C-alpha cells in the first residue's frame, strides 16, 4: 500500500518562513509529478504548488507565486515547499500527492495523498514589550553603590533599543542580549549602577524602543 | 485561470436516496476532471477520474458524467460511509484547480440551539487567565454564528470554536466557542454576552452573565 | 560577494520536526559539496551533514544519523536539512556552508558560510491539561434539562479522552474536536445535558485521560 | 573518526602580544586543517588551509603551521579586532570535525561580581507571572556559577541567563539570571535566594528577600 507523510507542520507568525517535507514507502517518486494541496478552514481544497519529473517544470498557485518554492529529491524520494512572507491566509493543512494511475499518462489524477500537516500563521507579525521595573533594594550600603534597571518581557522579534534618562546616563550601563522563552517570545534586561546616594535626587527612567512594532515605553523606577 | 464552480455547498439527504453533485468549469477541460471524497481530519480519496472513470476498488454506486462545462457526480443509494465532502478537481499536466466542495449530511428538521454561557472558573482566574464558554447545543443545520459582547462592545480577534460532527442518533451538531482574555482584561467590564444566530430562531438568542454574581 | 542564508529555524519541542532551508546569492551550489553545521551553546562548532555535487554522497554525524537527512536542488540552488525526532542536544546556531576555493581541488575548506538560523529544542515533549469546571447556571430552567461540562486547557500533543462518572454517563454528552491556541497548546471542552432536578443530588465527575504524558484527572462539577 | 583537540579553552591576553593555539588530532591527518575565526552572532571567517596556506584577504599577522597531529595557529601583534573565538577544523572529503573552540580575551585582573536580586513587581506578578531577575556585575574571568534556590531548595529548568561581552573600558562581563514562576507557584514559597560562585570570591555569596518584604 503506497503511503507519503508530511513533515514540518507548525506555528508562525505572519510574515515568517516554515519548510514542509514529503516522504514516502513503496514507490519510487521519480516517474511521477509531485504536488503540494491544502485544505483551508471553510473546507475547500486548494491547489499549491506541482513539480514535474525531473524538475523540468514546476508551477503555483497565483496566491503564492513568488512566495512558495517547491524542490523534489529523486535519490532519496522526498519532496519539499519552502513557504515564505507567511499569510494569515496561508493557514491550512498541507497535503502532498502524487500525480499518477494504473499506467502512466501525460495527464493522471492525484492517486495516492499523505494524511496532512496542520500549518497555522498567526495575525500578528509583531508585539509590543512589556516593562517592568528593577526597583533598587533598600538595604543597599550607605555611601554609594546601587543596582537598578528594566525588565524587558515578552515582545518580538529582535531587537530593542534601551536608552536610560534619554541619554544623559550612560556610564555603568549593561544591556543584556535578549534571550527566547519558551512562549516565542524574547526578553532582556537592563541594568545600571548608580551611587546609593542619589535615589530621590536623581530620578531614572529606561526608554525603551522596539523598532519593528513602532511602540515605545519610558518606566519610571523608583525605591521599594 | 479555469475557475470551478461546485454545487451545491451543502447537500441534505437521507439513506438509501440517489442524489446529484454539479460541478461546472468556467471553460471547456473536455474530461479533464476528477472527484475526490474527504472525511474530516482525513486525508481525499480518489474516486473518478476522466469525468467518468472509477477507480478500482471504489463502489459502483458512484457514477460521473458530463464533458465540456458541465460535470455531475451521482452517488446513487446513499449509504452511511458516504456522508463526507466531495471535491470536483479540473486537472492538468503540471496544475489543478478544485472546487469549492460540497458537504452531503444527513437531512433532518430544522432545529434552534440550546444556548449556555459559563463564566471563568475562581481557580482559573487565580492563574491570570479568563477562558468563557458559550455552548451551542444539539441544532440544525450546521451554519450558525456566535457574538460576544463584552459591555455590549462586539469582540473579535480573541475567540476560537468547534463544531462536533452530525450526532450519531439526532443527526444534530454542537458548537462550542471559547473566549479568552486576561485576569486584567476580564475584571476591566462587568457584563459578558455571546449572541446567537441560526435558521432555527426567530431572532438572535443573548445569554450573558455580570462578573462576580 | 557570494552569500548564503538559511530558512526555517523556530521554537520545537522535544521529538519534533523542522525542516530547514539554504538559498545563495552569486553563485552556482552545481560544483560545490554543500554541508550544515551547529554551533552549540557551548560556543564550540559540529559538523552535521554533508551532501556531495550530483548528490551523490550523503555523509552525516553520529549524534544525527537516522534523525536528519540532507537534500540538494541543484536547479534552483536550494539546499535542505530534515530534522526528525530532535533532542535537546540538537539546540543550536545552524549554518550552511559550502566546500571551495579559488581552484577547486578534491578537498577544499568551508570558504562561504551563512549568517546562521537558531533552533531551539525545548525539554518537554509534552504537557499535561489543566481541568476547569464549567459549572451550570444557578437560573437553570426549573423542570430539567441544564448543562455543565469540563474545560481541558493547555496540554500537548493531541489526543486527550474524557468520559464522565467512569462511563455510566454517555447521553446528552458533547466532547469537542481540539483547538490550537496561538500558544502553542490545545484546548477542549466536554459538556453534557442533564435534568435541572439533579444537581445536589447526583454528582458529575469529568474523567480526562491525557495518554502522551500519562496523566490523569478527574474533577468534580458542582454548582453556583 | 578523529577527535580534535583545541588548547588552550580560553587563551587571556593583551593588545599586541604574540599568542599560539594548539590544535591536536587523535591520528594523523597529514596538513587536512583549516582554522576559522568567529565573532559572537556572526558567521565563521575561513583563516587558514591546508594547515598552514593564507586566505586571500587574511592579514599576515595570522599563521599556521604543524602536520601528521600538532598544529598551531599564531597571530603575531594581536589587535582588538581580533579578540574572538577560533576553531580548527579537519576537513576530508565529504565530512569534517571541528575542535571545541579557543576564546581569545583581553586578560586583566581578577574581579569578584557585585550582586544584586530584584524582586517581581506587583504589577507582573497580578498578571500571574514571576520574574526574579540575578545580576552579577563586572566579573572576571567569564565563568561564573548562578543557582536559584527557593526556600533552600535547588531549582532546575526554570531560569535563563544571559552574559554581555567583555566591557570596552574595564574588560569585564556581565551577567542576568532570570527566574520566571506563575503567580500560583510563586506564591507557595517565602525565602527567594540567588547563590553565586566565582573564582574571586573568598566563598559563595547569596542575596535573598523575604517574598512581601
Known amino acids: 500500500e503506497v503511503q507519503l507523510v508530511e513533515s514540518g507542520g507548525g506555528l508562525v507568525k505572519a510574515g515568517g518562513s516554515l519548510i514542509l517535507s514529503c516522504?514516502?514507502?513503496?514507490?519510487?517518486?521519480?516517474?511521477?509529478?509531485?504536488?503540494?494541496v491544502r485544505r483551508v478552514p471553510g473546507g475547500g481544497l486548494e491547489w499549491?504548488?506541482?513539480?514535474?519529473?525531473?524538475?523540468?517544470?514546476?508551477?503555483?498557485?497565483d496566491a503564492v507565486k513568488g512566495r512558495f518554492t517547491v524542490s523534489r529529491d529523486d535519490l532519496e524520494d522526498f519532496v519539499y515547499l519552502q513557504m515564505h512572507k507567511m499569510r494569515v491566509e496561508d493557514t491550512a493543512i498541507?497535503?502532498?500527492?502524487?500525480?499518477?494511475?494504473?499506467?502512466?499518462?501525460?495527464?493522471?489524477?492525484?492517486?495516492?495523498?499523505?494524511?496532512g500537516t496542520v500549518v497555522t500563521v498567526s495575525p500578528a507579525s509583531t508585539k509590543g514589550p512589556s516593562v517592568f521595573p528593577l526597583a533598587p533594594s533598600s538595604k543597599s550600603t550607605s555611601g554609594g553603590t546601587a543596582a537598578l534597571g528594566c525588565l524587558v518581557k515578552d515582545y518580538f522579534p529582535e531587537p530593542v533599543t534601551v536608552s536610560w534618562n534619554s541619554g544623559a546616563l550612560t556610564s555603568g550601563v549593561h544591556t543584556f542580549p535578549a534571550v527566547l522563552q519558551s512562549s516565542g517570545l524574547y526578553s532582556l534586561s537592563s541594568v545600571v549602577t548608580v551611587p546609593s546616594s542619589s535615589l530621590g535626587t536623581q530620578t531614572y527612567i529606561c526608554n525603551v524602543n522596539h523598532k519593528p512594532s513602532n511602540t515605545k515605553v519610558d518606566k519610571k523606577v523608583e525605591p521599594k | 485561470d479555469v475557475v470551478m464552480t461546485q454545487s451545491p455547498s451543502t447537500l441534505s439527504a437521507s439513506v438509501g436516496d440517489t442524489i446529484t453533485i454539479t460541478c461546472?468549469?468556467?471553460?471547456?477541460?473536455?474530461?479533464?476532471?476528477?472527484?475526490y471524497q474527504q472525511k474530516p481530519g482525513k486525508a481525499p480519496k480518489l474516486?473518478?477520474?476522466?469525468?467518468?472513470?472509477?477507480?478500482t476498488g471504489v463502489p459502483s454506486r458512484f457514477s460521473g458524467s458530463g464533458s465540456g462545462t458541465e460535470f455531475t457526480l451521482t452517488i446513487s443509494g446513499l449509504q452511511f460511509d458516504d456522508f463526507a465532502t466531495?471535491?470536483?478537481?479540473?486537472?492538468?499536466?503540471?496544475?489543478?484547480?478544485?472546487?469549492?466542495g460540497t458537504r452531503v449530511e444527513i437531512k433532518r428538521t430544522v432545529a434552534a440551539p440550546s444556548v449556555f454561557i459559563f463564566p471563568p472558573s475562581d481557580e482559573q482566574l487565580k492563574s491570570g487567565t479568563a477562558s468563557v464558554v458559550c455552548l451551542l447545543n444539539n441544532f440544525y443545520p450546521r451554519e450558525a454564528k456566535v457574538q460576544w459582547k463584552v459591555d455590549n462592545a462586539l469582540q473579535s480577534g480573541n475567540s476560537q470554536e468547534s463544531v462536533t460532527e452530525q450526532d450519531s442518533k439526532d443527526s444534530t451538531y454542537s458548537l462550542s466557542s471559547t473566549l479568552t482574555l486576561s485576569k486584567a482584561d476580564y475584571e476591566k467590564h462587568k457584563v459578558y454576552a455571546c449572541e446567537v444566530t441560526h435558521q432555527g430562531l426567530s431572532s438572535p438568542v443573548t445569554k450573558s452573565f455580570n462578573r462576580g454574581e | 560577494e557570494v552569500q548564503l542564508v538559511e530558512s526555517g529555524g523556530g521554537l520545537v519541542k522535544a521529538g519534533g520536526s523542522l525542516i530547514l532551508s539554504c538559498g545563495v546569492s552569486?553563485?552556482?551550489?552545481?560544483?560545490?559539496?554543500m554541508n550544515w553545521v551547529r554551533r552549540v551553546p557551548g560556543g564550540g562548532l559540529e559538523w552535521v551533514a554533508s551532501?556531495?555535487?550530483?548528490?551523490?554522497?550523503?555523509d552525516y554525524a553520529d549524534a544525527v544519523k537516522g534523525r536528519f537527512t540532507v537534500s540538494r536542488d541543484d536547479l534552483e540552488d536550494f539546499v535542505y536539512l530534515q530534522m526528525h525526532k530532535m533532542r535537546v542536544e540538537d539546540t543550536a546556531i545552524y549554518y550552511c556552508?559550502?566546500?571551495?576555493?579559488?581552484?577547486?581541488?578534491?578537498?577544499?575548506?568551508?570558504?562561504?558560510w551563512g549568517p546562521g538560523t537558531v533552533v531551539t529544542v525545548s525539554p518537554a515533549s509534552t504537557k499535561g491539561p489543566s481541568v476547569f469546571p464549567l459549572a451550570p447556571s444557578s437560573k437553570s430552567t426549573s423542570g430539567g434539562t441544564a448543562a455543565l461540562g469540563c474545560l481541558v486547557k493547555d496540554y500537548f500533543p493531541e489526543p486527550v479522552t474524557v468520559s464522565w462518572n467512569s462511563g455510566a454517563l454517555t447521553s446528552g454528552v458533547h466532547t469537542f474536536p481540539a483547538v490550537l491556541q496561538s500558544s502553542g497548546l490545545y484546548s477542549l471542552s466536554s459538556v453534557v445535558t442533564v435534568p435541572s432536578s439533579s444537581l445536589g443530588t447526583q454528582t458529575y465527575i469529568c474523567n480526562v485521560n491525557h495518554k502522551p504524558s500519562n496523566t490523569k484527572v478527574d474533577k468534580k462539577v458542582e454548582p453556583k | 573518526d578523529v577527535v580534535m583537540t583545541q588548547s588552550p579553552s580560553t587563551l587571556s591576553a593583551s593588545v599586541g602580544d604574540t599568542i599560539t593555539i594548539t590544535c591536536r588530532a587523535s591520528?594523523?591527518?597529514?596538513?587536512?586543517l583549516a582554522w576559522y575565526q568567529q565573532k559572537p552572532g556572526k558567521a565563521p571567517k575561513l583563516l587558514i588551509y591546508?594547515?598552514?596556506t593564507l586566505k586571500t584577504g587574511v592579514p599576515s599577522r595570522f599563521s599556521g603551521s604543524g602536520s601528521g597531529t600538532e598544529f598551531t595557529l599564531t597571530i603575531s601583534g594581536l589587535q582588538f579586532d581580533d579578540f574572538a573565538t577560533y576553531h580548527c577544523?579537519?576537513?576530508?572529503?565529504?565530512?569534517?570535525?571541528f575542535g571545541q573552540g579557543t576564546r581569545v580575551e583581553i586578560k586583566r585582573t581578577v574581579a569578584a561580581p557585585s550582586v544584586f536580586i530584584f524582586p517581581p513587581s506587583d504589577e507582573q506578578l497580578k498578571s500571574g507571572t514571576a520574574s526574579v531577575v540575578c545580576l552579577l556585575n563586572n566579573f572576571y574571568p567569564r565563568e561564573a556559577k548562578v543557582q536559584w534556590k527557593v526556600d533552600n531548595a535547588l531549582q532546575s529548568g526554570n531560569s535563563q541567563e544571559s552574559v554581555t561581552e567583555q566591557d570596552s573600558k574595564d574588560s569585564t562581563y556581565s551577567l542576568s539570571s532570570t527566574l520566571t514562576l506563575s503567580k500560583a507557584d510563586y506564591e507557595k514559597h517565602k525565602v527567594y535566594a540567588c547563590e553565586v560562585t566565582h573564582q574571586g570570591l573568598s566563598s559563595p555569596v547569596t542575596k535573598s528577600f523575604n517574598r512581601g518584604e
Open positions: 552569486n553563485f552556482r551550489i552545481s560544483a560545490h559539496t
Open positions: 556552508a559550502r566546500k571551495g576555493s579559488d581552484r577547486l581541488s578534491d578537498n577544499d575548506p568551508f570558504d562561504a
Open positions: 591520528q594523523s591527518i597529514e596538513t587536512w
Open positions: 577544523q579537519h576537513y576530508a572529503g565529504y565530512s569534517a570535525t
Open positions: 551532501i556531495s555535487t550530483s548528490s551523490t554522497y550523503r
Open positions: 591546508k594547515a598552514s
